[PDB]
């Protein structure tokens, strides 16, 4: 028998608190979508050898390492995971956290354990900046996590803590301060020509932007918690789009992420802004995934199809929010 | 038979968004506490005459009016309500909303209806600034509501919308963006010598302070959503107290509320700040209720007892958060 696990992608609106004077750092607003999706089957490896197929090399190595670590922790069998549908790696879909937690959960189910997904994220070294994929794996929908309390030594050297996930200090994953069902609105996903960053390239860029001005952290909290989140809660489409657009085009950190990718992303965001068929548009992390909202999906479809034919984007599709998170079925 | 209803008081940390340029106005962080509490019994009035006892005159009139309005709406009997334990009126405990919703709910139960408490709040003209007592009646705990979307005509004359509850434009109550269980920490309630405001006095004061600077709205969102709320979620007492103190002593609107009451409140807040037994202290609305947090309740008890004996406060008691909201039992 196998444990078949399905999980949504994570789209990120923004990181929030990245200045040198705040009580807390990070905080992320995010939502779960069905496409791109993860589908994986976990079964007992007859030869006791951990085996992974269907993913990029980096993810395959960390999945193997995770299944070895969990084999020991839960005194369980060697597992083979066949990733039948992989989340695109390093594309703004939170692929690694979402895949590790889904496969870890499915392996848990094989072993007769039901792991706390946040505790499993901690076990696998996730959540040192973002609790987004961790929270959305458990709950789906729209969430804003509370980031991380800044220790007493933060103020004297903030760049010790204000880092990308790969270089961030060891801490537990944040918990969700806000978790809501996303309204039954369609989401337009655009794959831009944006590049994948190098680890050292990203760390140097991050230290060139953070710490951001205190007032910009505050304004970002304001746009997320007193703009995005209430509009989701009240299913107010026009209010939601105004908040998304204010973050995309004026968010200090988000503008830095856009500028780092350059025209490959900025031209698509500008085209979305000019297009009457697109009510709001956003870059997830540094992309290449962008996402858009529309009360005229029929028109936005034709606009995206033309952009793809012209080669200004790689791909586009409509999806809907996932309001559950991961699901599992036992199959042959 | 009677419907016996018990409900907690509402303590307010701060109003959030009160500037002339924001997407939304208001937003309130609040928590429910057991003491002061409401206890009321609702029964059928044999003579078909709506009767209220146990409250101040203003509350008794609005309760009678509410029970008349609901008698018609639900085609039910005339009700007598005996308020056996009243929430102190105009003292920072959200007495009117909390009492109207509890008695309305209990009357509902008498009529064989289970009303949506937020819709009942709308019916009774509550929630034009604060969704705090409305949300806490339903859920208890700690909550931050999302305030109200600012209409297109807001920017040209913000004082049309930025008003106290009594003078605010007709709108539905806000919904909770954040709702959490409060940790099992004790709360010290202090009744100061603060005065009750007049309606015209409050409206003129409010227009003298609002609209507040945009940056102060943003910083208040930051302290509430990226300070108070994550510390509640993570049950981090020191982080919680740092956020409470930053709001009390630096919050732009809160400082204006303190200054309007003067030494009667400011001296108690300053005494709490200086006192090693008090880790954090706060004014609920304009008071006279203040509330405090301590990891040394034994020491804070002796400190409050001395303040009361000296006459710097009227009263003090320890209570705990209510994590349920209103409850009802059918009695003889
Ligand atoms: O734990 P999470 O909420 O997923 O957030 C952390 C990860 O997400 C971002 O990359 P991206 O969205 O591109 O995901 P990936 O790098 O795992 O594919 C970031 O670069 C981290 O790699
Ligand atoms: O709907 P709510 O969340 O209760 O908030 C609205 C009411 O609360 C404040 O007064 P206060 O806390 O003193 O309550 P009261 O004036 O009803 O007693 C404010 O002056 C409003 O009167
Ligand atoms: N989640 C992230 C984001 C984001 O969501 O924008 N940027 N950096 C990170 C990170 O984890 O390093
Ligand atoms: N709830 C309020 C507060 C508060 O909680 O501080 N100040 N004014 C109001 C109001 O309703 O007018
Ligand atoms: K547009
Ligand atoms: K103190
Ligand atoms: Mg990444
Ligand atoms: Mg009042």
Author numbering:
A (entry chain AAA), B (entry chain AAA): 10 to 341
Text from the published report:
In the specific case of formycin, the enzyme ForT catalyses C-C bond formation between 4-amino-1H-pyrazole-3,5-dicarboxylate (APDA) and PRPP, in a reaction that is driven by the elimination of CO2 and inorganic pyrophosphate (PPi). This structure establishes that ForT is a member of the GHMP kinase superfamily. Glu211 is essential for catalysis, and we suggest it acts as a general base to make APDA sufficiently nucleophilic.
In carrying out our preliminary analysis of functionally important active site residues, we discovered that the T138V variant expressed, purified and crystallized more readily than the WT enzyme. In our structure, the Mg2+ ion is coordinated in a distorted octahedron to both hydroxyl groups of the ribose, two oxygens in the pyrophosphate moiety and two water molecules (O-Mg2+ distances of 2.0–2.2 Å). The interactions of PRPP with the T138V variant, which are dominated by the 5′-phosphate and the pyrophosphate, are essentially unchanged from those in the WT ForT/PRPP binary complex, and the phosphate moieties are found in almost identical positions in the two structures. Compared to the binary complex, the ribose ring in the T138V ternary complex rotates to create the APDA-binding pocket, a movement that is accomplished merely by changes in the torsion angles connecting the ribose ring to the fixed phosphates at each end of PRPP; akin to a seat of a child's swing linked at both ends to a rigid frame. The planes of the APDA and ribose ring are approximately parallel but do not overlap, thereby positioning the π-system of the pyrazole for nucleophilic attack at C1 of PRPP, and the Val138 side chain adopts the same position and conformation as that seen for Thr138 in the WT ForT/PRPP binary complex. For example, one of the carboxylate groups hydrogen bonds to the backbone NH and side chain of Ser174, which orders residues 172–179 of the protein in the T138V/APDA/MgPRPP ternary complex and positions the adjacent pyrazole carbon 4.6 Å from C1 of PRPP. The Leu24 side chain is stacked against one face of the aromatic pyrazole ring. Of course, that the T138V variant is active, albeit with a 40-fold reduction in kcat, poses the question as to why we are able to trap the T138V/APDA/MgPRPP ternary complex.
